[PDB]
Design a protein around this ligand. Sequence first.
Ligand SMILES: Cc1cc2nc3c(=O)[nH]c(=O)nc-3n(C[C@H](O)[C@H](O)[C@H](O)COP(=O)(O)OP(=O)(O)OC[C@H]3O[C@@H](n4cnc5c(N)ncnc54)[C@H](O)[C@@H]3O)c2cc1C
Ligand SMILES: Cc1cc2nc3c(=O)[nH]c(=O)nc-3n(C[C@H](O)[C@H](O)[C@H](O)COP(=O)(O)OP(=O)(O)OC[C@H]3O[C@@H](n4cnc5c(N)ncnc54)[C@H](O)[C@@H]3O)c2cc1C
Ligand SMILES: COc1nc2ccccc2nc1CCC(=O)O
Ligand SMILES: COc1nc2ccccc2nc1CCC(=O)O
Ligand SMILES: [Cl-]
Ligand SMILES: [Cl-]
Ligand SMILES: [Cl-]
Ligand SMILES: [Cl-]
Ligand SMILES: [K+]
Ligand SMILES: [K+]
Ligand SMILES: [K+]
Ligand SMILES: [K+]
Lengths: 589, 590
Amino acid sequence: GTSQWLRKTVDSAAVILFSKTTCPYCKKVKDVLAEAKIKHATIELDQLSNGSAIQKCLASFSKIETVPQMFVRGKFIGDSQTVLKYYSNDELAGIVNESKYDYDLIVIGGGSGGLAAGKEAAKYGAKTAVLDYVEPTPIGTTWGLGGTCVNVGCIPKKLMHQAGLLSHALEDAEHFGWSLDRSKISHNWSTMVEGVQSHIGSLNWGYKVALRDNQVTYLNAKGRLISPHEVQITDKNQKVSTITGNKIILATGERPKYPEIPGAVEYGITSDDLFSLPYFPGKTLVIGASYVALECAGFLASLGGDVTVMVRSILLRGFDQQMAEKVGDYMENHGVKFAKLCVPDEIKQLKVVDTENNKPGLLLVKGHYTDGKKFEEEFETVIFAVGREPQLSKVLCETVGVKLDKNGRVVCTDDEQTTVSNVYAIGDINAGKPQLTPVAIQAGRYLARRLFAGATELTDYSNVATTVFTPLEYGACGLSEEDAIEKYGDKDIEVYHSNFKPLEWTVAHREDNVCYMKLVCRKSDNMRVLGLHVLGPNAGEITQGYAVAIKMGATKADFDRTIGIHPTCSETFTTLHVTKKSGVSPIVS
Amino acid sequence: GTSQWLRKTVDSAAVILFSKTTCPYCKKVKDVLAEAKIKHATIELDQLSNGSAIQKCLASFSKIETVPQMFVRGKFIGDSQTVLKYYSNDELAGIVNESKYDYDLIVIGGGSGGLAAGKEAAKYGAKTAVLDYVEPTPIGTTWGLGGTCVNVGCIPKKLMHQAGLLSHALEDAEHFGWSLDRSKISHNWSTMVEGVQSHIGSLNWGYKVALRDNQVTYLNAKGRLISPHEVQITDKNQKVSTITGNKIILATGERPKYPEIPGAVEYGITSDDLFSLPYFPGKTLVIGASYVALECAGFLASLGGDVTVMVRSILLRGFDQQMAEKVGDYMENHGVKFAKLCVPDEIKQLKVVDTENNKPGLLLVKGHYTDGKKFEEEFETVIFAVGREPQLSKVLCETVGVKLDKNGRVVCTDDEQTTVSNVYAIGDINAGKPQLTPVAIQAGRYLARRLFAGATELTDYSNVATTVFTPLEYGACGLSEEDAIEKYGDKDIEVYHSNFKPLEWTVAHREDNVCYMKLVCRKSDNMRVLGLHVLGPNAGEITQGYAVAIKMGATKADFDRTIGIHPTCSETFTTLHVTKKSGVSPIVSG
Ligand SMILES: Cc1cc2nc3c(=O)[nH]c(=O)nc-3n(C[C@H](O)[C@H](O)[C@H](O)COP(=O)(O)OP(=O)(O)OC[C@H]3O[C@@H](n4cnc5c(N)ncnc54)[C@H](O)[C@@H]3O)c2cc1C
Ligand SMILES: Cc1cc2nc3c(=O)[nH]c(=O)nc-3n(C[C@H](O)[C@H](O)[C@H](O)COP(=O)(O)OP(=O)(O)OC[C@H]3O[C@@H](n4cnc5c(N)ncnc54)[C@H](O)[C@@H]3O)c2cc1C
Ligand SMILES: COc1nc2ccccc2nc1CCC(=O)O
Ligand SMILES: COc1nc2ccccc2nc1CCC(=O)O
Ligand SMILES: [Cl-]
Ligand SMILES: [Cl-]
Ligand SMILES: [Cl-]
Ligand SMILES: [Cl-]
Ligand SMILES: [K+]
Ligand SMILES: [K+]
Ligand SMILES: [K+]
Ligand SMILES: [K+]
């Protein structure tokens, strides 16, 4: 069962060397290639279970079983003697560039997955193109290379979150003996946005150069797949040309949804517009209850905003709801208001945005609660966070035969492969996968290795940790309590929980018994940890490490036998004893 | 194999119930005991590999193989019919108190290990006493129940560390758009100490109540083992009485050493004195280079102190020295000066401490460098951090026949047992163990279970993670790079490293490529992680989780196959690719 792979590897590899670590002639070929700046895949037969078998099977393609053996785009070019010849003749350099296609890999979308998968392909000799185009938001907002995370996501939102937490640090400082008057300290939104944008601008250029450095051809162009190897590009001048590629990776991501109600698109904004917004939003309504909505509501309120969240049903749908409710209660006792069981019917305009004076406008939101009562209040700014969607109607002609699911997302096999043999899909557009930056990065790299370096390792999308950067952070890894109970049954679920108080909150006179953690375990499987959950400061930092134990199948005994680091929030995970079955209080003393 | 256990368990258990989960009369006995507020051990025979064998073996002690079966201090009390009889007659509270000894357990020392081991013993019906006495420092400083960590260690030092970090928070705030000038903001030492001591006072009281609530007899008394079951106590009035215990746990910990040079004891202080000090130390010398010395130097400097560290040899002896050097370089570019290769010869006094105005005095430190050159500078305050030592009775433990090693520490087996069968030792006095609070707690609890609840689980003292709360924190778990190379050979050691920059430092205009992490792995064992090391903010929070993966034998492949959380410092451990062998640079950029 080796030859299936060898055909797949040889034919799709751009430049590949079948080698050994202990082949003197394999060393000479490697050394030379590096001097000619010729990048390539290297598969070392002496470090594979099936080494013998592959040597004998190469005979099909090369007519010989020796090492080394260099291939270019499916074609055997030779052993060490033949490659050195072409080098001293200078015909080698032009041989490794001979391709049917302009490009070994075209990547449509220069975001988290695209950039990762392009840079990795180029490491193994792939003639690579990244296409990126940021279609503007309704009010005109646009941005540079990087994707959602870099420009309008993880990066700006966490920096603003940090702006938020420093507020409490100013509070905490007086109690820890510092002589500042927190009451006479205000926040300048423009100063903050200047700093955030400055950093994004440098990430934009950083990514431009990363591509240039690794000989990846960046085109600032809308790409459209008109057939399996043809990509139709459209540049800033509307100049429409075609470029050919062997392997196509779709990596186009998603954009914010707007509710289908009058005034939404005209008068309100999304996350896309928030992170470069030139004026303070002022009195703000966030419509939606996802991590984006509460993250944004949280930081706006911490920067002295008047913030209301309108929630259709529940907070953080898809997350453990005990933890979701605790996140919401924190925000509610710390200045964020909620309109529960409420939807928007209409956005009406009272004042237009004053670009002259950097003020926002003024809007009237009409809505209604589930019992039929009316909602009617003024807000300076209205942020929709009611979901994100792909639009491959833009990007793939429906006639190419890439099956999309009911929600517009690409249906892929376990190796990111679409219904077209040479076309792949990664990141937010890959149906069913968790919509996270690190997941788009590991998927994109691991795919590029499989295409261009004969790797077999697939991405593992299971037990992917997360962190919601609400004023009080919520980290998690694996199943919500409710999901564990549905899958294994209540009699098979043991839940260990405890409140805690960060030592930093003691002198600072913050709350006892609001920070909280639990382990959802499975009795019949040695109390296997199915779910880790924590609400407190630096939840991401706390949670991350445990993701490795959970991947490895950590049991409750594994948490117990580990010794804590003192003093930390994290340590309380090493001494949990109170079960939900016991009814004993998780408050601590 | 199993009757050996049953003898050991039944004999040493205070109150124990041989049970099953699906025994209706076992439920009735349990329910009743809980109503009578009678705490006890429960062993469920139907949840053990060896269940059948234990039922048949009870016949030696009880004359029967039924469940349930209740025992008190090695005496069979009865089956369910006999126990429900004794309950309705009210003879039952009587029967569970009968003891040869005043106490099932005396614990000498009410610190991290002692308090943990006493509270746990009482959970399983043990008649328990905790003795705690704080001998005052040379200047007279003293404190409440809780031990070194609570009053003089982890708690006050991290709170002062937090005071330190908020300095940077004030700086970072201006850049994130907040309208304060760091230059017009100073720190009040007394305000800070007031709040820290307030918190310690609440832990002092908290611990006193936790003991009372669990029916543990706290005695504020110097305890002394005069024989294997007899403990001689001496209260604040010098009233010298004796109390008997079945099992004795020594948990007396350590106190600061002073160098044998003139003026050290008279004119200078230690960590014990610092955390309640009524005046800002001002221009300060720390002698020593341990985690205490650099932790204390770091926070003093951050609170506008003029701080110098005198280092005999290297920073953080016993820790990975690449990481130790990087911790020191941070402190050096952030206001801490170092006198390298230097020892103190003399502390001379120029002014006495000004108790009138709560300012310090003034001292002259005379010392010398390893090349022979002189050292002479004025300091307002001089803190010794040159080691801690067991203050254990040095001849008494001999009279009793508890072997101490050459350094004053108790030589124990892997089950915390001393050379006297009924006497145990836990925490910093236990020779060879890591001197850490959570290690003292785990030791104490797991021992109390083994004595009073028939547990067999030992403590695992290996790969116990640490965190040095230097202004830039250093977390670690397992072997230093140099220790791994010495044990396995350099050919077999692969080291993955990378610099990083916290996103929080980007708008804040702090350093690129000073934060640093590495994984020391073993090539011949699937790149098994032998050591994780990290210098950045929240190092303890970062490090903790990985301690569990390493305990379970995490490989590099295990870190790679895990997906990162973005954006965090921790995630950079899920994508390390640069080896030290390759010579490629650790430096990064977005
Ligand atoms: C507000 C917000 C906060 C988030 N916070 C986090 C977080 O903290 N942590 C986390 O892990 N994830 C977070 N995410 C999710 C994360 O941003 C995404 O999972 C990730 O960016 C998606 O990667 P991608 O490459 O699939 O798509 P994207 O990063 O969206 O990249 C797609 C790119 O392709 C462009 N494009 C579209 N069509 C074409 C075309 N035809 N031709 C060329 N280019 C095209 C798009 O405009 C974009 O530049 C957040 C998302 C949002 C919206
Ligand atoms: C400055 C400093 C900072 C530290 N920071 C940390 C940290 O961040 N994290 C960490 O894990 N560890 C830290 N440690 C170490 C930690 O404090 C110790 O490991 C821990 O205190 C050991 O607990 P123990 O029970 O062994 O002894 P202790 O906690 O010291 O308890 C011993 C107690 O017994 C009393 N005693 C002694 N003899 C008698 C007697 N005959 N009768 C009655 N009472 C007696 C003593 O007065 C004392 O109260 C720090 C230590 C210091 C000095
Ligand atoms: C994820 O989007 C939703 N899925 C649902 C599934 C079942 C029931 C309701 C649901 N509501 C939403 C989005 C609206 C909301 O979150 O209230
Ligand atoms: C434990 O203290 C020491 N251990 C050593 C071990 C081996 C060699 C030298 C040593 N010097 C010290 C003394 C403190 C110091 O390191 O400066
Ligand atoms: Cl750009
Ligand atoms: Cl609860
Ligand atoms: Cl500084
Ligand atoms: Cl920070
Ligand atoms: K759009
Ligand atoms: K706590
Ligand atoms: K533990
Ligand atoms: K970084």
